[PDB]
Amino acid sequence: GANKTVVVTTILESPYVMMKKNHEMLEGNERYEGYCVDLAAEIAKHCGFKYKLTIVGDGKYGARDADTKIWNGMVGELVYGKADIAIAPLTITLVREEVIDFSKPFMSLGISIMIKKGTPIESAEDLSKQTEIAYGTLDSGSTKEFFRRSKIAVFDKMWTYMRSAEPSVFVRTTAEGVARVRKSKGKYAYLLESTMNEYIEQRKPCDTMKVGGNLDSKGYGIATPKGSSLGNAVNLAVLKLSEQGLLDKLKNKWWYDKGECG
Amino acid sequence: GANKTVVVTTILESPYVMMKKNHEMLEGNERYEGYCVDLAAEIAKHCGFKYKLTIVGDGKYGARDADTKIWNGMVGELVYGKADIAIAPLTITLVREEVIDFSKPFMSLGISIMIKKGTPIESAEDLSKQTEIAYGTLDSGSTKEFFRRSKIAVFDKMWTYMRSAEPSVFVRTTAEGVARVRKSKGKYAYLLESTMNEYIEQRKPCDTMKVGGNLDSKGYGIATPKGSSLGNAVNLAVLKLSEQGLLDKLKNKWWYDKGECG
Numbered sequence: 001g002a003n004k005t006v007v008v009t010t011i012l013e014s015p016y017v018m019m020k021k022n023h024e025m026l027e028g029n030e031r032y033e034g035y036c037v038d039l040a041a042e043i044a045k046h047c048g049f050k051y052k053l054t055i056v057g058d059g060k061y062g063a064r065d066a067d068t069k070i071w072n073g074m075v076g077e078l079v080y081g082k083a084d085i086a087i088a089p090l091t092i093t094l095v096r097e098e099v100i101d102f103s104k105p106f107m108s109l110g111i112s113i114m115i116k117k118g119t120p121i122e123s124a125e126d127l128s129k130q131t132e133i134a135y136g137t138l139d140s141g142s143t144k145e146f147f148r149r150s151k152i153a154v155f156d157k158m159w160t161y162m163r164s165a166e167p168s169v170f171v172r173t174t175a176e177g178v179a180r181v182r183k184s185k186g187k188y189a190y191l192l193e194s195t196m197n198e199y200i201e202q203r204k205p206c207d208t209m210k211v212g213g214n215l216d217s218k219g220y221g222i223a224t225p226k227g228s229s230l231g232n233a234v235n236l237a238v239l240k241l242s243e244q245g246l247l248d249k250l251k252n253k254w255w256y257d258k259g260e261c262g
Numbered sequence: 263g264a265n266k267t268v269v270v271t272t273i274l275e276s277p278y279v280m281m282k283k284n285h286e287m288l289e290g291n292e293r294y295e296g297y298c299v300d301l302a303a304e305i306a307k308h309c310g311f312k313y314k315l316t317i318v319g320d321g322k323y324g325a326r327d328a329d330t331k332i333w334n335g336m337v338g339e340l341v342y343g344k345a346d347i348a349i350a351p352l353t354i355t356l357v358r359e360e361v362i363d364f365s366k367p368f369m370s371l372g373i374s375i376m377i378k379k380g381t382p383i384e385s386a387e388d389l390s391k392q393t394e395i396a397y398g399t400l401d402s403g404s405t406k407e408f409f410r411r412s413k414i415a416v417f418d419k420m421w422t423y424m425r426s427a428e429p430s431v432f433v434r435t436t437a438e439g440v441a442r443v444r445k446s447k448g449k450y451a452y453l454l455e456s457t458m459n460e461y462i463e464q465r466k467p468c469d470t471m472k473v474g475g476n477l478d479s480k481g482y483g484i485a486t487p488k489g490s491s492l493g494n495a496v497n498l499a500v501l502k503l504s505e506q507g508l509l510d511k512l513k514n515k516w517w518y519d520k521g522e523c524g
């Protein structure tokens with residue numbers, strides 16, 4: 001029927017979507033800025049739809065409760081019809097691909113290690129072979145699921161430690177994990193996606209850094225409810241933006257163009 | 263109806279698909295070895311189908327003739343029903359996505375520069391600002407289309423030069439481009455995907471090397487005819503293989519495990 005305003009679900013995660021300094025002075029979409037904000041505008045223009053940016057209610061990416069089988073986060077908002085599309089650093093995973101549609105990836109990444117500068121850790125193997133330095137991941141995300149499901153010796157060992165570590169090594173938001181790294185004097189290391197790791201390394205106080213190679217390789221995709229008529233155009237738009245070098249341009253804009261660590 | 267033997271189209275491109283040294287002593291699939299050969303076996307197992315590997319008749323990846331609008335290469339074999347699926351280093355592109363289906367990428371890459379060791383070239387900009395060193399790309403592939411369609415100053419300049427360069431700077435196969443780099447005493451540079459560039463750098467006589475950063479970022483996907491019932495299972499299989507670390511394991515097996523340059 002008649003075209004409707006597309007409800008976009010996203011998440012406050014720097015530098016993808018951030019509240020503008022003067023957000024209280026603004027309305028609707030103008031309140032936000034970031035890589036995914038710019039991306040949303042581009043996708044909307046190439047697909048010919050108008051939209052409304054909304055921040056996921058529970059502030060989560062998306063995981064299924066082992067008992068209720070209920071999905072939370074952005075994935076849940078799509079599954080239960082609360083949102084028409086998710087434009088955020090949402091990792092393409094098998095369990096998610098089965099319940100929602102994903103465009104081809106618009107950004108690539110891999111799980112990585114964030115340490116406070118000077119921390120005597122160079123790899124995941126280093127972390128797994130010691131206990132003085134605690135380490136964890138984000139909750140309700142793909143990184144935690146990666147360790148939970150891995151049969152790779154080193155990652156299995158890490159998961160075995162993290163799952164029963166006390167106090168908890170898991171955090172509710174990336175900002176929390178970063179804060180813990182910064183305020184733990186090198187006694188806490190954070191496992192997060194290289195993309196977020198790289199961004200933080202260029203932010204003051206410039207006291208963190210990515211160490212070692214990525215643990216895996218994957219990407220973020222724009223998600224729509226399974227079977228959504230929007231999926232097709234969105235996917236083609238992602239490819240066009242990729243081929244025009246627009247995606248690369250947006251990453252440089254939000255990651256390095258204005259890096260604060262030289 | 264009854265399950266049929268799936269006809270797989272692929273291409274002789276090292277180290278994706280190569281004729282085994284003793285291929286004349288073998289039959290069918292046993293004749294070949296390589297990253298895509300192993301990948302084909304994995305995909306087939308997880309999707310539950312048996313298959314027959316076939317080498318694309320014209321030895322091309324796939325491009326549409328501007329006049330006849332006829333597709334050649336592996337893309338054409340899928341479009342015209344000669345093959346049921348393509349398992350090869352086939353780049354996911356917009357023009358192709360429109361006529362065939364692509365699974366999520368199983369390997370990432372970007373266009374890069376291959377030089378004979380010692381060549382005074384460090385970047386695409388370097389190449390574009392000189393003429394003593396010729397440079398070109400593969401025919402009927404995504405790299406050539408990249409330069410033909412780019413509006414980015416440096417790449418536009420490069421394309422303008424390549425399209426009218428004499429003698430021709432374009433080659434029919436990757437092996438030809440590499441041979442030209444090796445036998446041109448540094449007077450020819452080859453633009454090819456980082457994946458193939460990296461493989462060659464680890465092959466004797468160890469006289470080539472990748473220089474500069476990738477010009478773009480994309481990936482290879484397994485392709486099926488548009489609407490094919492195989493697409494779904496194949497995509498899920500790619501994700502599972504990605505998550506199990508199998509894809510990373512296969513790349514190491516064919517790229518570095520037995521590198522010949524230390």
Ligand SMILES: Cc1cc2c(cc1S(=O)(=O)N1CCN(C)CC1)S(=O)(=O)N[C@@H](C1CCCC1)N2
Binds near residue numbers: 107239
């Ligand atoms: C710019 C870009 C385009 C792109 C991807 C990543 C990226 S990136 O921003 O993550 N790029 C990665 C490499 N890095 C050196 C620069 C940034 S991707 O591999 O996740 N998806 C691909 C599209 C194009 C065909 C495959 C899907 N494009």
Ligand SMILES: Cc1cc2c(cc1S(=O)(=O)N1CCN(C)CC1)S(=O)(=O)N[C@@H](C1CCCC1)N2
Binds near residue numbers: 369
């Ligand atoms: C192992 C692997 C998995 C994978 C990709 C590339 C690769 S890779 O072999 O190209 N990998 C790239 C990074 N390099 C350091 C190691 C090899 S990808 O980005 O092209 N596609 C992704 C899947 C997983 C979700 C997105 C599609 N997985």
Ligand SMILES: N[C@@H](CCC(=O)O)C(=O)O
Binds near residue numbers: 090
């Ligand atoms: N991008 C991840 C969240 C970050 C993480 O898990 O490290 C996801 O989609 O779940």
Ligand SMILES: N[C@@H](CCC(=O)O)C(=O)O
Binds near residue numbers: 324400403406
């Ligand atoms: N992978 C490319 C071929 C190699 C190249 O163009 O450099 C394609 O699918 O066309």
